[PDB]
Amino acid sequence: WIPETLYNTAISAVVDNYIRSRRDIRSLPENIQFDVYYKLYQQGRLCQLGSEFCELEVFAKVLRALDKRHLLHHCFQALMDHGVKVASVLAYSFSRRCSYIAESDAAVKEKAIQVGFVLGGFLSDAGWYSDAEKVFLSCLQLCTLHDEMLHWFRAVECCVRLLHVRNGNCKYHLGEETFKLAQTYMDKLSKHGQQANKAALYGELCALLFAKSHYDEAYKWCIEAMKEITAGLPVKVVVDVLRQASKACVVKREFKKAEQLIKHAVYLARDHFGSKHPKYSDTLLDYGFYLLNVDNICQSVAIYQAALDIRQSVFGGKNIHVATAHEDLAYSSYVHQYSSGKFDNALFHAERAIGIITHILPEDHLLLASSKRVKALILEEIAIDCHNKETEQRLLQEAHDLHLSSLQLAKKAFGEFNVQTAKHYGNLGRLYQSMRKFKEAEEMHIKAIQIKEQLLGQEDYEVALSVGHLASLYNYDMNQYENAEKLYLRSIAIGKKLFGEGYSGLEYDYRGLIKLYNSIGNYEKVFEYHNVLSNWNRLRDRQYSVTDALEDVSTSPQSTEEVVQSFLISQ
């Protein structure tokens, strides 16, 4: 045993005397007040802590201790799990303070905005975007009431953050308005001869346009954002732009540049922040997105689980940042453990994603659509892999209503002709294929293919995947092998063009053609596709010797200017 420090003993003595010295703690130095409040959290006195943190005067001084912010994120979240709505109370208090000081000078307004920026950054880092948006709206109103140079800079820096909290809140219709306000303020800034850097705003707009599935415009603003990265930007801005740039490159089918972008982002996050930081977890989440979309699913589970374990540590349960990690790990575990049939860990994560999102967000929120979609995909495969026809009907019907709810949400938010509603159409087509309703399955796959080829060119990965699904519907079920053979050839051609001969998705097309020709004839075709499948299996076994992706990132591989310059040179 070792003697506990006089500091910690005195904190235990002050906390124990809490009723007699509740207001005297607020006169302590800002590095002692947070330790006392953390002792209140550790002792279990969540009610007293929640009463104190609901006051903006107390919480502002707590936010000034940036060393132990990882300790604060797990306290605040606990309060939000305790049932006390600390985020909305703090946002309301800040809005009231702003409404009170709207009639004042420019000295106290600048003080409140700086308090507003740290509070909004905390509320959007913890995942309370609907509650951080009010704080940033108040800050924007303060920066709008006057039109000086510093207030123009603060208005731009506040519309950058307001765009971010309207992207993670799935308010994509207000994101365009927020970007227009930011663009207006930046044009007025450049009118006076002072230029503000546009990397963070263009990166947030890239995330907006990618989340709306506007991948062409997303890549255009990706290039525009990377054209505005300097050596003096904060590491958070560079990390965010690198992440969204990698995601845009992935969905533009440009994995050769997305790899360097996202690996450099992960290296920067792990270097500056650490291995247990929320921003490092966000980089890991986007890196898992990259790895899942480059036929490298086996490593992606190792990345999402790494991303989730960081987010469960800093935040804890009942958080949207943990919920997104769950709904992404659930889909990656579903994809990885698809042929294995072991949807036990995949469903456990998808249950927590919906179990968290339903608690913290309304039933009409788009983030619930993606968590419902993954669990509906998992429930379908559990249904067809079980033997009870009662289970095969109950789970399939649950997946049906989940898919219809997700489709309704995506159709209401995006529209009839977006990529993310075509993905729900394709999933519904697969579900109807499993559910022995084929007339609707063909219609669903036709709609998904038509929407994803009207939008995403002719030879994209997504349209190839939906073509493969429709071809499996035609081959195994409808026996219309004339169309199924053509669709298999299209899917194989696109997969080979994009992923090469080592594509893991080519098995479901090679076996499909083997069964197709076994049904109709041409045993020379059966033999040729059988030996092609054997060569594919040999190549996949050769390529299966992979390593850990965090080690693939390594330490100090590139430099910040080098990656951006290489990306720009490669267009």
Partner: peptide, 7 residues
């Protein structure tokens, strides 16, 4: 299986 993974 008969078809590929979900999207």
């Amino acid at each position: 299986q008969k078809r590929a993974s979900g999207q």
